[PDB]
């Protein structure tokens, strides 16, 4: 029912998103992007690992769904069902088309503009595909889970352990000091950054 | 469209703006003694058959509306022909629309 993924791989068209100009788009195969214990705080999942793309290609929504499932299945078995948090950092927004599957119809290349077939995500070199945050002792399991999810993707991917704290944008070596100095206020899965560039009442509330 | 039955426009004979009566121009009947009709009749007589085209690929659905303006000055009573754009419905001296009416 679906063409081999080699037919849609090389980002040969301009972005073709779902809009008022492109209607009738089938829903993407991947609808859940955050998995595991999403409600965990910053301080409990300090280690972060990324699956980084090493090619300029487009990855299908089916591939993203397959990789997410197999990465989740391994990390549940190895780290428990509440010992990690997986975030898929790719959303399928590009729509790929297909020409008609072939008396009353005009055959050939006449009127050959296609109909929507599926959705793929355009990824650049050095761009993160998936991220997993966990405790510092589950480094080997994070590498293994991302390694198995590589086989679901066409091109080449590299597994990288981040220098930042969890899913935040702040370095893990400075994170605790910033929290103690009240520069970083935890909120939910992430953190808030507090500058010295506002009304002094906010500073009063923080230090009260 | 709705065009009022009277309008104040320039009069070429009077040299100035005058009230005019507005009517709808209608094509007069063929003369039967115009030179083109005489020539066509001479060509059409005999055994040749139809000698000139008969138009059949009609495309226009409306017609340009031509207004006949007649000066109301009794000594002048001059006329002019003033065409407006195509319209499907044309009304002369219809009621004027108002905005406070209940729909």
């Amino acid at each position: 029912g679906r063409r081999p993924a080699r037919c849609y791989r090389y980002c040969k068209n301009k972005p073709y998103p779902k809009s008022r100009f492109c209607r009738g788009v089938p829903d993407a195969k991947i609808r859940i992007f955050d998995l595991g214990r999403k409600k965990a705080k910053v301080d409990e999942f300090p280690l972060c690992g990324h699956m980084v793309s090493d090619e300029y290609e487009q990855l299908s929504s089916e591939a993203l769904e397959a990789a997410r499932i197999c990465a989740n299945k391994y990390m549940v078995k190895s780290c428990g069902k509440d010992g990690f948090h997986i975030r898929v950092r790719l959303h399928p927004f590009h729509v790929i088309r297909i020409n008609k599957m072939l008396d009353r119809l005009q055959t050939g290349m006449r009127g050959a503009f296609g109909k929507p077939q599926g959705t793929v995500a355009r990824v650049h070199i050095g761009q993160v595909i998936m991220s997993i945050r966990t405790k510092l002792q589950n480094k080997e399991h994070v590498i293994e889970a991302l390694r198995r999810a590589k086989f679901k993707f066409p091109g080449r991917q590299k597994i990288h352990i981040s220098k930042k704290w969890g899913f935040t944008k702040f370095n893990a070596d400075e994170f605790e000091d910033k929290v103690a100095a009240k520069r970083l206020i935890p909120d939910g899965c992430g953190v808030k950054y507090i500058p010295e560039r506002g009304p002094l009442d906010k500073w009063r509330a923080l230090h009260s | 469209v709705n065009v009022p039955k009277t309008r104040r426009t320039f009069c070429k004979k009077c040299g100035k703006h005058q009230p005019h009566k507005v009517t709808q121009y209608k094509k007069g009947k063929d003369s039967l003694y115009a030179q083109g009709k005489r020539r066509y009749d001479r060509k059409q007589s005999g055994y040749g058959g139809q000698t000139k085209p008969i138009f059949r690929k009609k495309a226009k659905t409306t017609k340009k509306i031509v207004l006949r303006l007649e000066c109301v000055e009794p000594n002048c009573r001059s006329k002019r022909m003033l065409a407006i754009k195509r319209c499907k419905h044309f009304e002369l001296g219809g009621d004027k629309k108002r905005k406070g009416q209940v729909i």
Binding site: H50, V52, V128, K158, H160, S162, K163, K164 | -
Partner: protein, 159 residues
């Protein structure tokens, strides 16, 4: 093929700049254009009358006629291998004075006065412009401070 419409593809060139919509500033109507001066054509979408065609936007010409609200301009237009001097009428809002001519008129003034000063002082002064010459020889002092040694940095794979 595409249309021959007059404002096709002027979506951005005739739009007003960001946070610069509204009333046209009044000094644009107060600029005075004489016969023979050079003006830049830049269509403004706020005024739809006397609007130059898109092919004259960004073009520069000289005034040959002055009317109550508009100006006639002799503008060069390239047409399929020949350049012809078109005459176009543009309202005042879509034009402004060209600063290239003003700079040259200033240089003529300082040249003529420098000739008069040179003749009265019995000296010779340079009046022709010259291209940037090669840099002259000079000394560079170290001030007893050794140059800092630079070195390529090791590669690091970031996120």
């Amino acid at each position: 093929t595409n249309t021959k419409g007059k404002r096709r593809g002027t979506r951005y060139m005739f739009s007003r700049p960001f946070r610069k919509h509204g009333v046209v500033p009044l000094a644009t109507y107060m600029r005075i254009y004489k016969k023979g001066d050079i003006v830049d054509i830049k269509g403004m979408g706020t005024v739809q009358k006397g609007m130059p065609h898109k092919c004259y936007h960004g073009k520069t010409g000289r005034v040959y006629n002055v009317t109550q609200h508009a100006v006639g301009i002799i503008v060069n237009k390239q047409v399929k291998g020949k350049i012809l001097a078109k005459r176009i009428n543009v309202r005042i809002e879509h034009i402004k004075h060209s600063k290239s001519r003003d700079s040259f008129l200033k240089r003529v003034k300082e040249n003529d006065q420098k000739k008069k000063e040179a003749k009265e002082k019995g000296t010779w002064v340079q009046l022709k412009r010259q291209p940037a010459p090669p840099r002259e020889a000079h000394f560079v002092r170290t001030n007893g401070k050794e140059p800092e040694l630079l070195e390529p940095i090791p590669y690091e794979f970031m996120a």
